[PDB]
Design a protein around this nucleic acid. Structure first.
Ligand SMILES: Nc1nc(=O)n([C@@H]2CS[C@H](COP(=O)(O)OP(=O)(O)NP(=O)(O)O)O2)cc1F
Ligand SMILES: [Ca+2]
Ligand SMILES: [Ca+2]
Ligand SMILES: [Ca+2]
Length: 341
DNA sequence: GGCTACAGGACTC
DNA sequence: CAGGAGTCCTGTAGCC
């Protein structure tokens, strides 16, 4: 088939840039301020300007400020990027109803029944970048190919404001050369493991004994990687349905005392419940990030919908359980709701 | 043996 | 110096 992957550029940063065009040209850094102290927090995203100097998502805001003391540091406004993202998705629908929105930032379009070959494809790619440019003034990178993985990779390879095609020929080219750590779903941990057995390329999974690979990375990944090696990988582009909604907050200071954690936990529930909108969850999970940045959680599934009232009460137990089954101090607390009726 | 819930792990954006 | 949100998978144990 033919998948055309769409990825917005420095989305959070660019959105901010669209609303305040004077930001144009400067290093913009959208961050998540934790409130613990002047500049505590991490980076959500940074435009290419901030990026070329090492400012990337996931690092502490304090770090970013050393490298770029005079960079614009804006606080995250996710609801604005969401209203903006939504508008762009609706446009993409105008190009195919077999559309998979993977995130607030990416969309997969199965254009198997629109373009005959990769040529009208590349063309439809251009037609879309322009449409989004004339509509919302947002640059996006377009990745085209036979399956979702390579379309995404195509895009990774062309950003930003790009558009690349990866024909069947290059798919074999890449299966043999592309760095396996560069394959969607392969993080450092798995990558190490992989390139711990030569595996530095997809095809290498074709040579090794299945159980050897399956014993190291699991049945799902060994198959995922193998299916890609054989150029036999297919995953339908499907309407994605949210499976869970939650909220988590950082406490002004670590602690293990229950009365000092409830306010946070309870507010997490207020917002969570807000977002559920009209969804009724049957499972609730209390998620706690320990002082050493570990993650412990306790959940519960009910045979019925959970009222905010019940969510409140049950969360206290799960938290209790957590505390009582681990002796570390919490740093963040939150709740996640799932299994919607 | 395999299906369920639950808790941990890994990854991603 | 370590934010926020969400998905998929695996190991363990209860159960048929
Ligand atoms: N650690 C992260 N925290 C975040 O909040 N984000 C958010 C969630 S979606 C939005 C995507 O931003 P951007 O498009 O800049 O990230 P990419 O990885 O797509 N880089 P791009 O090539 O500029 O898109 O960034 C991403 C992250 F990677
Ligand atoms: Ca992305
Ligand atoms: Ca993006
Ligand atoms: Ca990687």
């Amino acid at each position: 088939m033919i998948v055309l992957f769409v990825d917005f550029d420095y989305f959070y940063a660019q959105v901010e840039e669209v609303l305040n065009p004077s930001l144009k040209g400067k290093p913009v850094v959208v961050c998540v301020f934790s409130g613990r102290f002047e500049d505590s927090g991490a980076v959500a995203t940074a435009n290419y300007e901030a990026r070329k100097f090492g400012v990337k998502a996931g690092i502490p805001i304090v770090e970013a400020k050393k490298i770029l003391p005079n960079a614009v540091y804006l606080p995250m406004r996710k609801e604005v990027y969401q209203q903006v993202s939504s508008r762009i998705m609706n446009l993409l629908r105008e190009y195919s109803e077999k559309i998979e929105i993977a995130s607030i930032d990416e969309a997969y379009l199965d254009i198997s029944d629109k373009v005959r070959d990769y040529r009208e494809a590349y063309n439809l790619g251009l037609e879309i970048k322009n449409k989004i440019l004339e509509k919302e003034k947002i640059t996006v990178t377009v990745g085209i190919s036979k399956n979702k993985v390579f379309a995404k990779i195509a895009a990774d390879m062309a950003k930003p404001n790009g558009i690349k095609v990866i024909d069947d020929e290059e798919v074999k080219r890449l299966i043999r050369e592309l760095d396996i750590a560069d394959v969607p779903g392969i993080g450092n941990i798995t990558a190490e493991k992989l390139k711990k057995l030569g595996i530095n390329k997809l095809v290498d999974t074709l040579s090794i004994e299945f159980d050897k690979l399956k014993g190291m990375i699991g049945e799902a990944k060994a198959k995922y990687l193998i299916s890609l090696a054989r150029d036999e990988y297919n995953e339908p582009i499907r309407t994605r349905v949210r499976k869970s909604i939650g909220r988590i907050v950082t406490m002004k200071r670590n602690s293990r005392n229950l009365e000092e954690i409830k306010p946070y936990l309870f507010r997490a529930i207020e917002e969570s419940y807000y977002k559920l909108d009209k969804r009724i969850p049957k499972a609730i999970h209390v998620v706690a990030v320990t002082e050493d940045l570990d993650i412990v959680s306790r959940g519960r599934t009910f045979p019925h919908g959970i009222s905010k009232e019940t969510a409140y009460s049950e969360s206290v137990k799960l938290l209790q359980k957590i505390l009582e089954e681990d002796e570390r101090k919490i740093r963040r607390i939150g709740v996640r709701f799932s299994k919607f009726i």
